[PDB]
Amino acid sequence: TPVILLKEGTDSSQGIPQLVSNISACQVIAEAVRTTLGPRGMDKLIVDGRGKATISNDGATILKLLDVVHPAAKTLVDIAKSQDAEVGDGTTSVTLLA
Amino acid sequence: ALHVPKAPGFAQMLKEGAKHFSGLEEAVYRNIQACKELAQTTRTAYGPNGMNKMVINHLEKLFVTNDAATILRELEVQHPAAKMIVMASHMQEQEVGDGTNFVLVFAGALLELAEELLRIGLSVSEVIEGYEIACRKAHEILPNLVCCSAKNLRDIDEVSSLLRTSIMSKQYGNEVFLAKLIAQACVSIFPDSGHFNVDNIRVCKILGSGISSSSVLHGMVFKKETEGDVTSVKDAKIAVYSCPFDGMITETKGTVLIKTAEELMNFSKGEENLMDAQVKAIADTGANVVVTGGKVADMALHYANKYNIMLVRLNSKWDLRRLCKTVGATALPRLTPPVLEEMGHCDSVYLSEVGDTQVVVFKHEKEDGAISTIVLRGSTDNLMDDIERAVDDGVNTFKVLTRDKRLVPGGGATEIELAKQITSYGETCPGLEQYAIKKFAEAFEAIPRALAENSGVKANEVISKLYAVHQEGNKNVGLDIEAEVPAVKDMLEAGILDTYLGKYWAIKLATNAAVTVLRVDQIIMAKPA
Amino acid sequence: AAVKTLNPKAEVARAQAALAVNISAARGLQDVLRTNLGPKGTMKMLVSGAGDIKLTKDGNVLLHEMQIQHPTASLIAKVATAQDDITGDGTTSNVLIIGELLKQADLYISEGLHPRIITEGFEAAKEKALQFLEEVKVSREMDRETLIDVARTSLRTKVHAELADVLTEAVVDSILAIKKQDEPIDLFMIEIMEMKHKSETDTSLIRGLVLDHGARHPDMKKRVEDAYILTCNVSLEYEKTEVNSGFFYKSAEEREKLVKAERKFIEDRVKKIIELKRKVCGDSDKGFVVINQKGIDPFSLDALSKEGIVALRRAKRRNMERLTLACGGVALNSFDDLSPDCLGHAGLVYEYTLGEEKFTFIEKCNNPRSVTLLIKGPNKHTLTQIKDAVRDGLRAVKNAIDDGCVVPGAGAVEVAMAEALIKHKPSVKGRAQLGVQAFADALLIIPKVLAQNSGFDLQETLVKIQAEHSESGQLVGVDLNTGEPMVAAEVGVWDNYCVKKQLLHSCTVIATNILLVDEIMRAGMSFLK
Amino acid sequence: REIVHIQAGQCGNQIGAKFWEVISDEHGIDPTGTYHGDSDLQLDRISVYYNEATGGKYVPRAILVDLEPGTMDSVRSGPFGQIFRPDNFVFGQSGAGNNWAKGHYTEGAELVDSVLDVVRKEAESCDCLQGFQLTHSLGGGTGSGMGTLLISKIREEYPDRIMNTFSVVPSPKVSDTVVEPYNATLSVHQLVENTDETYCIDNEALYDICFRTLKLTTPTYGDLNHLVSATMSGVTTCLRFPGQLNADLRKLAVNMVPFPRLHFFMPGFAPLTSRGSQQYRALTVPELTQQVFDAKNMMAACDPRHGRYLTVAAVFRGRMSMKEVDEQMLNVQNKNSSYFVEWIPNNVKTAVCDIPPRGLKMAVTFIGNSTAIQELFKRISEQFTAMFRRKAFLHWYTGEGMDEMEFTEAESNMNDLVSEYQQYQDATAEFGEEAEEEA
Ligand SMILES: Nc1ncnc2c1ncn2[C@@H]1O[C@H](COP(=O)(O)OP(=O)(O)O)[C@@H](O)[C@H]1O
Ligand SMILES: Nc1ncnc2c1ncn2[C@@H]1O[C@H](COP(=O)(O)OP(=O)(O)O)[C@@H](O)[C@H]1O
Ligand SMILES: Nc1ncnc2c1ncn2[C@@H]1O[C@H](COP(=O)(O)OP(=O)(O)O)[C@@H](O)[C@H]1O
């Protein structure tokens, strides 16, 4: 106890509670791009720190502009760029399916 | 109230912020607990069913790993006792390449069992002697457990079966595909004359399709682009320069001086004419592509395009040396027409695109070449890096097989046999060293327990069935993974093997770590800063 | 109180307080150091502010690495080092005597005795002890077998039993190989090199040199079967005029001429070496190796590589001497007198690569006067532990050769002085008999600590030893596995003669000075700012 | 070519730690060692200050030496500590105590033998090294004592490589160590005959610029490192980036140092003023260049109006047009030409780098060789002489094994050096008793 193994401030979680929490986390990411699919889909407006505004319907572009830091959610962001870099179309379809 | 006034002697002279532990209670019992905690962290990352683990270092970088040595490097430990185990595991990786988790499980289990022996009346001096004798007795037994042999290390079909087990514990489900790839790359950089060097296998990661579309390229590939207007060559003669592709100047300061009208006008014309002849002289030998390790000039580029010379630039001082080996050419330190001996060859050089990326490919039609490269295609960066670590583990196994050709059964069949035979020897040793010997044999079981725990079955049913079968004389019976009910299986017939040198070093370094910790009696620590 | 009225921020400790502080703090250093004495001593762990680990058992190493802030712990530490750099062994026994010597003198002072009376007792006891030691020493031939015992007795108290068997042969052999006739042993010619690979039992002795750097050009040969060695410190690097100078040309054509001309000073030097190589090495059967203390340009490397001349750059200053006595060449500064008579000889040169770092071996010299010790191990802290134990072994052997005598140890001698000092104390006059009696008990801390650390009783065992040596006049010491009396010379325990003579001189001087201190005062400027 | 950087003591380690920090964030390097830039202009000369290890890693060419682990542990544990070479850290166990004798005779003697081995291992990895860089302070014992010993050992080992240094000059108004003048006088004596040139910087002007001109009524040392680290970058900047004329450190010596003994410069950094003035001052070429000859941008206690400049050098950073730079330079050269050189006209050396230092719109760097530096060295000597007469605190130096004659020896050179600068002015050559009789 007086000498602790790992440095103070280390966060450690595991088990079923950890795994279920990752499943619910990805639902928020798929929510931001859900209603941008279809012949009757909408856009989203995002404003960064400096005030510049970006209006876009491209699914891969929206996920880039979000400042996601959740480690499990970042997987869904990367597959968006994967579909972007190979075929270029289907960036939202690969996200809802995930 | 009153206070306890800091008894005199060494306590009153000690600097503030420092610590001083003494005796068995405050030094050895604490160190064993600290070591025990470290084992439980990576214990779940053992075996084919060992679950992945996710680590974020202090630089916000993301790692998803099964490799035990990788986890410890990015985890940062502060207890001195745990650090000793870490340095032991890192040494085993450098010397062998696989078995970085066998050290932690074995060294952790040894210290836990040595706690009770000290608890019932033995001393630290007698425990160490008992451990060391078993370590010597373990090695003498080990050669008797060899059950297979590597026959020909340039046979593609045979080798793929040798590396499959070394990959089965990393990428369960895709072990067949990855085993075939690494076999092709390693078997065709092989030298006749010996000395398989490991650096001669290159890995290039390209984002895109699934992992099944990755392949092997007999040559080298770079993520660059051509400078001139020439793009592809069909039968290339290559010249390699380590100097900038431009007119040279004196290293000492040198200025141009003019005193008359004619010299002012004739300077610019003279310089251009000299450059034209130098490039034409290069093209006279037949070179098709020029590769340089430095800056290129505009006039050289213009004349290179005129004479149909392909020009590339890359400055690594380590990629260029690798390129020299691949084509057989030799470097040049000055812009001179290359000698026919000094020019390499290549069957095709071209610029291609793969998954939104531009690459330059030096492809041989020769099966052997000098070095080979494996192209990785995945859907995420984290997915590639873990596969990259698997390729390293598979290659390092091939490196060992060249050094030694003997295999031993895996899946817990080796450790069970050692525990059975050490105890039989331990029964015939009178004295107080008989207890430590039996404890050493008892620690070997944790490796069959660790596999069984992660498999989702009861450990005691397997261990009981392994002992009963091994008493009948079966030295090749180990744990079965596919069975949802605990069971055993024959390992030699199932082709599950591991290198003899992997076990020989793993046992040696593990015990050396345990006895090193037990020799400590007191700790003096300086304050952090 | 006479110093506070001038500088109120001053700290002082007057007559009886000053003695109390010194004696109570000197005892503090003894309570922790007494567990190091003898081969049964306990190993400590040390951690600095960075988180490093350094296991040790030495006396001097422990003193400087323990967090202590005390004035009287600074006087002792400075003496222990002064006893270290000269003699090389005997630092732990230094502290034990000084602490025990102050304890005994305090025993009589507390009854109202002036300290100067005891001081005169120490001098009378010191002179008598130095005369007794002069007649106990054993003179021998210093054959190899005797030096083995002296080296073993000093390498056994600082590593485990099995390792001290290996290091003992290497230490004795290395001293003999470099030892000419009466000319004194000159160290700095026993190169200590550490290689972090393989188990620590592979420490060996190489009858030549090892260099921590190798060939830098790619096409240099990695092995040579019969080599000529050229040792020079001349520079083959591009150099410029001391006085300022610049190049003034007129056009492109003249610029090229000035470029080629400026390499002529260096290219002349390179041609001199090649012309010599063709002469002595007429056929392509021998070898040629160039060792330079300065840098070498890439252009110079290319010229040398075309002739198969292995070349190394920027070797250390000491190796400019060791290579001369090993191979047998001449260290020359210029090439204006190059001749075949100045080349050395060596029977094997090859290169070893350890991951990032490379090594080169010079072996099979005809009659080497210099050798190297190669240290191998799996950890950084282990290598340092071996390095310190090697330093003490060389000093112990060298002292046994410079002196013609060796003194039996194991605790036998101090008992002998204790006996002879008792029978002299009735002769002296006054209360100085108390000083002699105090010294006699001080010398008995060595036998007590040895028995105490093995697990025996101090009073019962020491009386057994004094029961002998009083009815049988043989020199009898302590046995560490039975507690019985033991004849020191017959078993093989030995101790240097200069160590004991200097140990008695140093300890008495400090205790004499410390006891005469009136007051401790700190009245000066607080900090140097 | 190849250069090596070496830091010693308290002040040297701090500046060097920041210096490597304000280099990695330009060239695309990261605190793990990879290169993450997309511009090939950064990697052309990346190898001058760096080594490349297998796997794409890059490591600095730096040696950190101190006699106490406290400072080295701070850098090792602090930011960017994982980048440095593991074995390059060399540390003692007892410190120096700021007694110049202790760091020059007793402790530094047994440490250089181990440090000299390290610099050999770094020099073995370069095809052709060109020179060294040293960073040290003149007040601490290790900076002065061990710094003097290191340079003497370096000179004997290496015959003709250049010796560039970055030493801070003590400001006696900030006296600190009661015995400051002893440390400063001896080191300068050795520096005169063993280095090509030294760049002096005082903490006084380091204190004034942030406090008065900018903000932060209480500026701590942490900001002071940033200001000097800005100056570190620039004299050194050209070296790591290409240019139309290859300006190497050797031609800096010949073109900036007319005399081998008067070779002490004071630098200048214009584009940094108040935060509001950073916005509202119209940062154009001539007002930015106007800070070169100002009384505020200087970082030495030497009045220029009472002095005469010898040679000047101007370094420009940013992507401009070529015309306006020369136009204003032509203007400025003749604007205040009254207070200019005595016999060396047209000293201006112009250097332009496309990529500016990261962070700001505009940047330049100025170097000047003054005849007013003697005003600084004179004051040091005057304070030194007043103490030597009383022999105050002398036993702490003489009693360590150094002869008293050295204190009198070093004094003579300081008077000799001052006489040299005084000779080149011809203005300072301009009575109480009543003896004015026949002849
Ligand atoms: N004429 C159509 N009728 C029905 N569905 C359509 C039609 N045109 C497009 N879609 C739908 O649009 C979806 C994807 O649109 P798109 O923006 O390309 O997705 P992504 O962002 O994943 O590329 C497809 O699943 C397809 O079913
Ligand atoms: N098909 C298999 N069935 C059961 N166990 C296996 C199989 N393949 C490998 N193993 C086990 O995996 C272990 C090593 O895997 P790994 O996690 O890499 O450990 P280490 O890190 O120590 O190399 C071996 O002890 C072996 O018994
Ligand atoms: N095998 C042995 N048996 C008995 N005494 C020994 C033996 N080896 C060493 N000693 C004793 O140990 C004492 C201390 O030596 P060592 O442990 O090296 O520390 P130091 O030399 O600093 O006192 C010596 O006086 C020697 O007599």
Ligand SMILES: [Mg+2]
């Ligand atoms: Mg494995």
Ligand SMILES: [Mg+2]
């Ligand atoms: Mg000893």
